Amino acid sequence: QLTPTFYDNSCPNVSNIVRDTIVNELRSDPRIAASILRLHFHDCFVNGCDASILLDNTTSFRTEKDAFGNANSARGFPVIDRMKAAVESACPRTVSCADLLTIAAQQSVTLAGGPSWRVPLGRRDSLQAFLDLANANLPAPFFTLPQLKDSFRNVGLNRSSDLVALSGGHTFGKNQCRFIMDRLYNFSNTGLPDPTLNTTYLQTLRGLCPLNGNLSALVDFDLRTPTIFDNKYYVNLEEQKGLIQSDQELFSSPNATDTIPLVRSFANSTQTFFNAFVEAMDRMGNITPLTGTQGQIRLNCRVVN
Ligand code: HEM
Ligand SMILES: COc1cc(/C=C/C(=O)O)ccc1O
Ligand SMILES: COc1cc(/C=C/C(=O)O)ccc1O
Ligand SMILES: [C-]#N
Ligand SMILES: [Ca+2]
Ligand SMILES: [Ca+2]
């Protein structure tokens, strides 16, 4: 029963405080809008959007931050702390960490040039973190299209539009050499690069990510507009210039009969992509929320009250 008006009486400036925090951080860290969107996705795919990802380690449960999809990868946690502190100062004990992160993701998208919309609100915060579930549920860059579809369905997103539109988050941000080395030098034990990678881009990427090189070096997900939220991600796919395997599979998989037309539709029209992104974002944001009196409004996003 979420609603976009949930804080219109109790904390009417929450989205403004969130926005100003991100505007400021972007001057020194141009990557932070992308990092924050990713945090929200990794929240919603593990027991729902319940801020379980923000919890640090305790002696009775491990943090999701040591999951394969989060360790030495997920980032931005201090920025979420700063905006939470600012909102707590303005509207004490009102806005859940789960909702804060949902607003932060939306405002990140708008600030980077994407659509503007009011997210549904009224989620509450978990009482535990789920490390094993994060290892089970977050999809990996080496997944096939059937594995990606199974990963989305497992959490409740059955639609191929959900998968294709939400993969558009890779219109900005960075990726480590580590996750493309197989594609550049030895794909699926063939001793060859992935044939679905454009051979001119292949040269470029080998230059950035040499064999025996720094596996933690960073590369841009979108070679056209690395920091702008736009539909250029889909244009790249159509040219075999998706960066990671899971990107290019949306256009090139044997199982892509349903996803190819969505990829083209989104490359062809900014409005069609933005409308679908908003619709899929709100469906992801509605995965198994705690509401009403279930869970908490956490005061410090890293610890249960
Ligand atoms: C469909 C399956 C997906 C997989 C396999 C995947 C995989 C990845 C991987 C491997 C990275 C780079 C991590 C690093 O190098 O440490 C990345 C980054 C990122 N992903 Fe995804 N992702 C997927 C879906 C999504 C979705 C649904 C969104 C959001 C709507 C998202 C938003 C992003 C962003 C914005 C970044 C850049 C983060 C920054 O630069 O800090 N991804 N993803
Ligand atoms: C209390 O802090 C803030 C309040 C606002 C209000 C904005 C508006 O009413 O448009 C904006 C930024 C802030 O940091
Ligand atoms: C770093 O990004 C990710 C890595 C994995 C999995 C890695 C593995 O199984 O080794 C899954 C999701 C991610 O977002
Ligand atoms: C994306 N993780
Ligand atoms: Ca969660
Ligand atoms: Ca872009």
Decide if 62 contacts 137 (C-beta within 8 A).
no
Q: Where are the domains of the chain?
A: 2-138+285-305, 139-284
The rounded distance, in Å, linking the Cα atoms of 111 and 198 is 31
Tell which CATH architecture fits domain 139-284.
Orthogonal Bundle (1.10)
How was this structure obtained? X-ray
- The tokens describing 115, both together, are 């659509």
> How many whole angstroms from 116 Cα to the centroid of ligand 3?
29
Q: Could you give the CA distance from residue 117 to residue 152 in angstroms, rounded to a whole number?
A: 23
Tokens of 285: 């944001």
In the chain, % helix, strand, coil (3-state, to 5) comes to 50, 5, 45
| DSSP 8-state code for residue 57 | P
* Ligand 2 pocket, residues with Cβ under 6 angstroms: 13, 16-17, 20, 90
Q: Are 94 and 10 in contact (CB under 8 A)?
A: yes
Nearest CA to ligand 3 atom 4: 69
Q: Closest ligand to 67 CA?
A: 3
Radius of gyration of the chain (CA): 19
Ligand 1: does its nearest atom lie under 6 Å from the Cβ of 174?
Answer: yes
Tokens of 110: 């708008």
Tell me which residues have their CB within 5 A of the ion that is ligand 6.
171, 222, 225, 228, 230, 232
Q: How far is CA 18 from the centre of its chain?
A: 18
What's the token pair of residue 244? 């990671």
Domains 2-138+285-305 and 139-284 belong to one CATH topology:
no
Q: What is the DSSP string of 272-283?
A: HHHHHHHHHHHH
Contact 153, 146 (CB under 8 A): no
> Residue written as tokens 């094993």?
132
Q: Which residue has the tokens 């619709």?
A: 279
Q: Decide whether any atom of ligand 1 lies within 6 Å of the 31 Cβ.
A: yes
Two structure tokens written together for 249: 């599979």
Interval between CA 141 and ligand 3 midpoint (Å): 6
Tell how far the Cα of 116 is from the centroid of ligand 2, in angstroms. 18
Indicate whether residue 140 lines ligand 3 (CB < 6 A). yes
Count Cβ neighbours within 10 Å for each residue of 88-117 and write b for 16 or more, e otherwise: beebeeebbbbbbbbbbbbbbbbbbebbeb
The total number of residues shown for the chain amounts to 305
Dihedral (Cα; 54, 15, 173, 283), 10-degree rounding: 80
The whole-angstrom separation of Cα 61 and Cα 162 is 31
For ligand 1, say whether the CB of 226 is within 6 Å of any of its atoms: no
Measured CA to CA in angstroms, residue 269 lies from 8, 42, 106, 265, 276 at distances of 33, 28, 20, 6, 11
Phi, psi (5° rounding) for residue 118? -100, 115
Least Cα distance to 171 among 111, 217, 235 occurs for 235
Structure tokens at 83: 């905006």
Q: 69 CB under 6 A from ligand 3?
A: yes
Which residue's CA is minimally distant from atom 10 of ligand 1?
Answer: 141
Contact between residue 164 and residue 263 where contact means Cβ atoms under 8 Å apart: yes
Amino acid at 85: A
Say yes or no: domain 2-138+285-305 is CATH 3.40.50.2300: no
- Residues designated as active site: 42
136 CB near ligand 3 (under 6 Å): no
Of 275, 277, 241, nearest to 164 by C-alpha is 277
Query: Token pair of 178, please?
Result: 């580590």
- Residue 268 Cα, ligand 5 centroid: separation in angstroms? 33
Closest residue to atom 2 of ligand 4, CA basis:
38
Residue list for the binding site for substrate: 139
**DSSP E strand boundaries for 140-224:** 174-176, 218-220
Q: Spell out which residues line ligand 4, taking CB within 6 angstroms.
A: 38, 41
Residue 143 contacts residue 151 (beta carbons within 8 Å): yes
Tokens matching residue 198: 């454009």
DSSP 3-state assignment of 175?
strand
